[PDB]
């Protein structure tokens, strides 16, 4: 059928699109969706269920490959399908076992073509197979990197898997790395990847109306302004701390597009996110070119260095660079603050809290007024500021930032959500 | 309608313009706006995108750097044509390379959509009366629409709304019918574009009117005497080469054969294919070898420029010279193209004293294959002008700019930008 309120249209320069046919206020569910195809990530064992994505403490053990928790024999049985991928190679291959996530990802979408080849009631109005590819734009280095999924996919998927031709096989990889969804939880952190039909259907926009939150493996999708009918529904792909220029080079590197909306247009935001002290002799063109090309360049830096580097050489990244930084850039800098955001992270995972509210604190008023009034970004933030009081005794400055996330998640997520319940429980806790 | 003058039909060339008042030489028959326009990738920098204008210092646009205007007046006001490939442009990178016929395609597809209706640039042939001659294309050629219809999906599926491939292919077939590519004042290509009402006039090899520039806008000038109930004819192709090459490039790109005093008479082919008649005079056969030798060589040193050297280039036409002047005189056509290729290596090697010493060689029998206002002729002593003024050969240099702005003066017209520059050039002592 049709989702109600909504209808499937072609956008002039956006090639296919959603949009609404009766008005949507802020905080209203346009429509839910259920996953066609999903996969829990692997630092989440044990804290999730594989089937249902329920976050709880003691989780039944699989037999065969002690590697998957499920909430009983109920969500066990029902993600046996889907396991059967890798419950046996996982133990044969053993700590050679390591393919990417979008690898198990397509995995289980070949699965579910093979065992429901017909519509899903995930994909009322757009089809697995309709998603866009962008084929003909694959860099020569890109398709390398799609080949070597598809060696990886035959490598540990061939038991169970009936592949179609080399050719199908690198546009359904193609297809996944543009139309694929990646699930996160109240701290927006990683929780896994899935496919969303329906949801893929929504174009992208730097100022969207609506906000993507998921509950367990369902997605739901809830306006974040007033939308009237007419309107293209359009959400966010990307995070939108960092100026046009630098958004700009994430959509043409991911998606092959170049956004065109009011602030890709415009820059009217580019003025306060790239902030210079203006000291007694102001800076010059060229020394403001050359600290924020040096900026693009230790976040970079920064984001290999996470994968092999001690924290505490972490930390010495942040602080160095701050200093660097710091002779040209305000503190309310975008730059300045993401390398502040890293080291409060850090601090976070050294249970060093004391050393992250410091940080926290410094960087929380700047964060906000670059994002969107309900933005997932600051709902977040607000919530590690607010849970790091919490264990330090600090219910005042506690529940105080507590409330700001949960004003905003009350829209993003909803009223009823289970994350809305375990914010108020924690406010309870005496 | 046009004032002076009215569309008809000719017999036997399909439509035409006819004129209803006295033309003299020099008078401007009438002005066309581009319908639409794109400039070619290497003059990028060096002409606006919006107006063709020459100049130093443009603005770079911010998304793709790889567009420049004159400031950012032009730069929104080529927006609506730009955002065709300002983003595919960087998303494509190395691999983004459509062809120029795909390039003026695609903005035609644009105009059309935002602008359905008559344009001021079609006031007596509308784009959708653009014949096609898709009756009388080859099968092999039906390959190489198909391969710009695959290109023009590939490249401008974002943007475009695309009819039948039946339609696309009968649009490419008016593109390749009725395409006219800019020329600078030196006759080196500046961009392509669409005249609607410029692209009526037929073909003669004895035009009354020549076509030239002013940015985008088509000026369309007489070259003879013009009296009233006479069919305006232009030339389609380079009059240089003999009535048998003129027609091949005729019913290959064209799909027509002319029949005008030249082609029916071939009054020029004894001198252009002229002879040297030593002692033992040339056999009849032996310049039936040389002339399908020389057809060769030409399209030989044309693919040649596409990856070959420059001292390549040069020993290509030195050792076609040396085997051609066995049989053929220095004022052969055939003789006179591949002195005219070593002029141009030479020029870009920056050896402008070996690039003068072919120049002068020609420049005289060039001229005398051509009617009396030709561009070809114009060009000529402007790059041998030019080429002087470099090596302060001022005396031969003015001199040889002088016959330029003969030529031009009734082509391009007086107030002409072109004729200001040139004159600029004679003045910075
Ligand atoms: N704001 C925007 N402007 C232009 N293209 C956009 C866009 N937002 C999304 N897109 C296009 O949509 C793709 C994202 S998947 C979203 C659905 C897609 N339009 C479809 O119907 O298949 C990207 O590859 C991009 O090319
Ligand atoms: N001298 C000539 N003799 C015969 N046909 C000619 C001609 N010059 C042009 N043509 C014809 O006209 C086409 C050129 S495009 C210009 C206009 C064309 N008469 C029209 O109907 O709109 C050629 O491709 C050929 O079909
Ligand atoms: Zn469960
Ligand atoms: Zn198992
Ligand atoms: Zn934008
Ligand atoms: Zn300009
Ligand atoms: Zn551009
Ligand atoms: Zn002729």
Redesign the interface.
Known sequence: EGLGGLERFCS??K?RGLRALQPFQVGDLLFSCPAYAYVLTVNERGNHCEYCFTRKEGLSKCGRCKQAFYCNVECQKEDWPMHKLECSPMVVFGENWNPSETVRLTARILAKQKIHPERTPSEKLLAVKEFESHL??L?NEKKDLIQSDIAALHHFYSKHLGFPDNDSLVVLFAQVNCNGFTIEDEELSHLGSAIFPDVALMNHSCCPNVIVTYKGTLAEVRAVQEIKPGEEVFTSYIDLLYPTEDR?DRL?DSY???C?CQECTTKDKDKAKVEIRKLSDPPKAEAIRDMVRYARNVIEEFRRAKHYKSPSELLEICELSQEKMSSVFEDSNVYMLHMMYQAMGVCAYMQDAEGALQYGQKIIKPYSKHYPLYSLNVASMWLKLGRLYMGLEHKAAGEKALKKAIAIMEVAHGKDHPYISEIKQEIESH
Do not use: I, L, S
């Open positions: 002039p320069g090639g003909d734009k860099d700009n043409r092959f597009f170049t065109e």
